Ligand binder design. Sequence first.
Ligand SMILES: CC(C)C[C@H](NC(=O)[C@@H](O)[C@H](N)Cc1ccccc1)C(=O)O
Ligand SMILES: CC(C)C[C@H](NC(=O)[C@@H](O)[C@H](N)Cc1ccccc1)C(=O)O
Ligand SMILES: CC(C)C[C@H](NC(=O)[C@@H](O)[C@H](N)Cc1ccccc1)C(=O)O
Ligand SMILES: [Mg+2]
Ligand SMILES: [Mg+2]
Ligand SMILES: [Mg+2]
Ligand SMILES: [Zn+2]
Ligand SMILES: [Zn+2]
Ligand SMILES: [Zn+2]
Lengths: 518, 516, 518
Amino acid sequence: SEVPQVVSLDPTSIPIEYNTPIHDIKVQVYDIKGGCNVEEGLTIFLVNNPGKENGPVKISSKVNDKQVSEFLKDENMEKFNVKLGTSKHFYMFNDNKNSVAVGYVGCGSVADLSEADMKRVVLSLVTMLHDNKLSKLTVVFEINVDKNLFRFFLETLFYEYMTDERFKSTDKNVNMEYIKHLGVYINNADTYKEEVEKARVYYFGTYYASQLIAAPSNYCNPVSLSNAAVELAQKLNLEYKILGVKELEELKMGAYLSVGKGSMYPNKFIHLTYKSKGDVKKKIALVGKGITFDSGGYNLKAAPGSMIDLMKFDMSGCAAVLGCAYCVGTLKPENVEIHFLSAVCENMVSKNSYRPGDIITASNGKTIEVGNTDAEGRLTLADALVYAEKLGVDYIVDIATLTGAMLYSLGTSYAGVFGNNEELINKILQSSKTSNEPVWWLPIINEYRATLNSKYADINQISSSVKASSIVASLFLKEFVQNTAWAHIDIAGVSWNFKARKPKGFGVRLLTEFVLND
Amino acid sequence: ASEVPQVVSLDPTSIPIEYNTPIHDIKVQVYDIKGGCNVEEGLTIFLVNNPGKENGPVKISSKVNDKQVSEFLKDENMEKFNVKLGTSKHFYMFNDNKNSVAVGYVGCGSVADLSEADMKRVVLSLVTMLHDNKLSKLTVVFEINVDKNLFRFFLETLFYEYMTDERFKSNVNMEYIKHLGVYINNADTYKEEVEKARVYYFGTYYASQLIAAPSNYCNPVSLSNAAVELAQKLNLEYKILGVKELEELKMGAYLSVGKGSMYPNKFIHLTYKSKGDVKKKIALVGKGITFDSGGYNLKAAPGSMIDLMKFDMSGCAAVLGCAYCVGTLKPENVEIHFLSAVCENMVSKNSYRPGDIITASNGKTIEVGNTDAEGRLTLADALVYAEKLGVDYIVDIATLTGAMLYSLGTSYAGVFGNNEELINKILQSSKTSNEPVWWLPIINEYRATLNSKYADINQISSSVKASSIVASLFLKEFVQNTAWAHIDIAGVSWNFKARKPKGFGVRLLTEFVLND
Amino acid sequence: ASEVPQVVSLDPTSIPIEYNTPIHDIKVQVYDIKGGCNVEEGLTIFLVNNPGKENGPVKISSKVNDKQVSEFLKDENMEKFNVKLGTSKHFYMFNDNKNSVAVGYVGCGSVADLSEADMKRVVLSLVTMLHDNKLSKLTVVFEINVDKNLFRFFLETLFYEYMTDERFKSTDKNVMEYIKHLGVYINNADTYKEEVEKARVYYFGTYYASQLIAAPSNYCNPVSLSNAAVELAQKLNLEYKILGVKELEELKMGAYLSVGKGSMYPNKFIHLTYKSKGDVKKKIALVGKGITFDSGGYNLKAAPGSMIDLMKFDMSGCAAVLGCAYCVGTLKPENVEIHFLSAVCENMVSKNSYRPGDIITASNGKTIEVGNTDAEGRLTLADALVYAEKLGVDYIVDIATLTGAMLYSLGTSYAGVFGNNEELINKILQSSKTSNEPVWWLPIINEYRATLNSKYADINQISSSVKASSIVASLFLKEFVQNTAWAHIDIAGVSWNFKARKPKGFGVRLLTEFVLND
Ligand SMILES: CC(C)C[C@H](NC(=O)[C@@H](O)[C@H](N)Cc1ccccc1)C(=O)O
Ligand SMILES: CC(C)C[C@H](NC(=O)[C@@H](O)[C@H](N)Cc1ccccc1)C(=O)O
Ligand SMILES: CC(C)C[C@H](NC(=O)[C@@H](O)[C@H](N)Cc1ccccc1)C(=O)O
Ligand SMILES: [Mg+2]
Ligand SMILES: [Mg+2]
Ligand SMILES: [Mg+2]
Ligand SMILES: [Zn+2]
Ligand SMILES: [Zn+2]
Ligand SMILES: [Zn+2]
């Protein structure tokens, strides 16, 4: 419970914003066949031109205003093109003689937008919202989108529009004002209406994970992160328990505890549970790596390219799992019981730290020879997986910023999924599709298992000879699931948006769609 | 033949090649295990497992036709030994006729389905005995369960691992066997795999010979000479394009790479055509860099492995190895073009430079960001050449990106492509050849990193570290409207532990051509 | 016996040590070859060579007391096999009593005197025949010439390589049975019999050192390692004193204390004494470097190739000295008093650690400017050498994993010896010859002395200019011995068997032969 401090100025909680400005936006959806009213604020058309690379803009909607309809005639629009992510603003007086702003974002010439294309559209729309004090946005869909992509549009709009100012003090943006109303016109509106508040929920799970990830290691440490998790559980009425060191010692969690030895913050293992009222048909454990700062330990992140300054993000797994708890707790699916687990700790340099070469004993009795203190995530996950399997679940899914090698294999757009069960992997791939968080299935190559044979311990933490480190880490984790369907999502390459200098909150919507689909 | 230039008169002017190998003299017989075993002669090895009982005892069930060997094989003696994968024992003894025989076993663990990796460990253990034996016959008794493809793989791997390459040396511990007996259940169905294995073995071994051949022996001229000689022996159509023809074709990307080399570029084009109607045309394109120094981007960083870079023509060797198999097995209804833009990547006053803008044969200008990304430059022009042939499929195979070691490692190659059906055919070939491959994505979001400020395209990304995916995006720019796949064998081509090539890809490509 | 401090309750509080090993249960019988060999149960291996003829044929020359086995081993049958060094074959047949027997040979090549390295190769071949074969007995027939020392070395090596250290195995023990009996046939057997128990003692001292070296730094820390030394003294009836920090401060051991400042484990200085019951004619101090983990300190081992993961091995000098104590205490030489010393500590990174640049005062009052916290071994040895000279001994010999440069100079096979006294160096070289643990004499080059001149302190810990780091270390140590014959053995290159992934226990037999032959 109490966060230790070195000096009185050290923070004792993570600041967390629950009621965000996005939550105050009144959203209305209307059917496009009634025509568009253009009365105030900004009205943006989403337009493409199938076939025609950089083709002309042609506004097809009925617009219920003579002045605006006149402005938007093909002749007047012909100067402009649909190049993806392109946009323009128009200014005019409507029939009520009130000035309005109108514009468009180009959605290109391929009639089915990828998740990345749609994100490009949303970013252009967001630049129209920034540096312009507007009370209302209206979006007219003149493109084709399924229900999941419409929801993705809104989630992405909400998340990209929201600006995280929790750590601003003298430099808050004096000009940021958020719209209070969002109008949407789309064909077959009634079927899209359900997606609006689901988007709002998914936006918040994602933005909540993001807040946790962006919070630096002096704010977000094992104690404050587990305290935040308790507060979340209380707000959603989830069952919760936080296991402290004495309980962890009783459970013989020697791999997890060795990692956190050198830290000033005691280890805290988070265990939240959602249980549907009614028959429980699937039981699922979701396990998130929760290293609140990864210095590397005695194998210090000192090599060029090791990104030590980014390592507050090494609890992104735990944050995805807590974001997922927010969504599941809010949407209340039937027929399931979900355990949201994270072994939280910090990997530090101290007289008290574990050392390279140390032999430690995991909670399932396996001895492990530590070959590199910087492979700490798999040690904490090892004990968390053992704990998960004891719960008697149908599926165990872990999510973790586990290996830097992901940047060289899949890069920054797709997460890797590994697993011991093809049906579970397919469920995750399915969830990747409907969440629009991209994942690619990678193999657990058993030929490399022999490189984890230790001369002294039961197993080596790291390979001597294999450089395929994401596969080797999956081989190691596999040793801590005995007989349960298990998949492991490595988000090391996708978690942080290096270009925008912010978290993605990657995996919240993926894991939630996984729970919901099941 | 073109003459190979020499700096001194001691410089070699051809690659030595062994066509006739001791493996070719092995008479192979397959017998049904249901009849019991004849152990009267030579070295007999039982392949044995113990399901469930991990590292459990050896127990041999087969009846054998010798009372002395029966005694040796009794449960009480055999239980002194265990089945741990690759563990072996063998003993010399006298049979009923007082003739020297030897008898032993290789442990096959306690899992009934052996993977190709597992089967490799079994074979290595068998080969260790063979490299220290001298008896005229080996008999292998399968008391384990393998499918037809895995049985073929066993044979191929046995032949390949048993054969030792002594071309560059100037045992009194062994002699090559003249006979191989195999006892296995349903022997009749397995018999047809034998000569197929012997063909796949030599395709693989031939590729290996070319890869292991050092870069003073195997240069663009001697390698293309070797391909002409292979084509002649197989009756394939062949054409070697030299520098003047290559300039006429405007192959600026490929020619730029070889500018620094004393050896003129040579583009190998062999063709197999079926005697009956052609229903399918395929181009197989192999990366053919006979030595990759890196160029001005010299391989000087720790772990860059410049000492290994004679292996950078592994894709070319795999294609030529495939041409041996195809030219030998003679598939019907197919026309296959075997292609390689061969050159050497060197440091010279004459070399291309980082920064150069060069023009590929399809008109695209390319800004060179790194002279050690030379493979994709030579493949760009080879791909444009392939597409102009009007084929149904283009498959390229190349030691293209060091990043493979960090994504899939040393066991599985990666495949990328623009066509799902073709990728699935490659995956299926991978399953039947037992040369493992994994599908990796061409991620279009990374394509913008290849937008050059000056040229039509960048050779490399400044930002994206997913270099195998970026390389594939680059190559995809050189295939306009044909099903195409790219196999990156950088991680998988060289066997680091054994200090020798794998010949990776021969069987994969041959299976592709034969079964599709 | 001090309490081992723990960070968590799962931290181990002692080093596990096996004293009664399966090798100790083996009954050894030596027979003279003139009586013929009896060939019965187990496995009977002939060691055969063929002088002149590289890879020449096997010919078995011993009389075998069995007609069937004699027929089997006749020249005609054996000539199809060759003597290539390390090569081996197994034979199966029925003896004259109709009982199946296993026989075989190991090739010993064509050179009539085997080097220590060649013999190791023969033994490794023999061990592979023992492994994965449930045998009650092994019989070895020598048809090669070995002197008494080489015979003993054969047995020591056999025992050492055969013994498998499973102390840290839990779930992965080798489901491994040992022979109960070892028969040896050799010419002039009566003359070799005395080597058998000597070999068995030397095996254990070596294996004991090996157990200490392989024990990871969480098990083997300065408190637990000094407790193990106490236990060993109690078992052997050696005197002992363990000096703790209060006594070390009183003795002004500032160099040694500074190295340990960063550790959570208090320094412990080990002092064991063996004294012969008769008139003492020689007094000897053996000093071993005792760093239980070397992180480098603030000069962290982060450089590629710094092998931080192997640094549990930095107490290998101390282990060799304690292995020597075992042998000496067991064999009980006369007319000698031996002091076994080690300044044990751990070199860590902490708010409390010593710093690059710190100036510290050794117990002989010399001030030392610290140039690199990773040159910590010579600082601990400085103080241990001052203590040792105060004892009033005739010879001081230290042994230490002191400099990585040994790998570039002598490599992994030979240790280097440096000293201030040629008579003593020659004694060490003679011990090397009779122990078969190779050492080469290296110079202390006075010309480099000047590069240890400190602008501020009395001396520099390290050279800024000279890259010959092993010689520089020796020069520095020389300054802490005023008037006594001293030698220094640098075992950094030789201690760890990199290929086999285990210690050699190097130095035990060398130091024991030194003591015995004096
Ligand atoms: C020691 C290695 C085998 C494993 C090591 N893994 C780690 O450091 C993880 O604990 C890192 N948190 C993973 C990471 C590294 C760089 C960027 C993003 C994420 C890695 O270097 O990838
Ligand atoms: C600059 C990069 C995008 C590409 C570069 N590619 C190359 O060097 C190729 O020409 C190499 N032939 C690929 C290679 C590297 C290391 C081991 C085996 C194979 C590489 O370093 O992987
Ligand atoms: C700073 C240098 C002059 C001295 C430094 N010495 C050390 O690090 C010792 O404390 C090390 N124990 C030496 C070592 C390194 C690698 C393998 C075996 C032994 C060394 O690098 O050898
Ligand atoms: Mg790490
Ligand atoms: Mg290159
Ligand atoms: Mg050091
Ligand atoms: Zn981490
Ligand atoms: Zn290359
Ligand atoms: Zn040291």
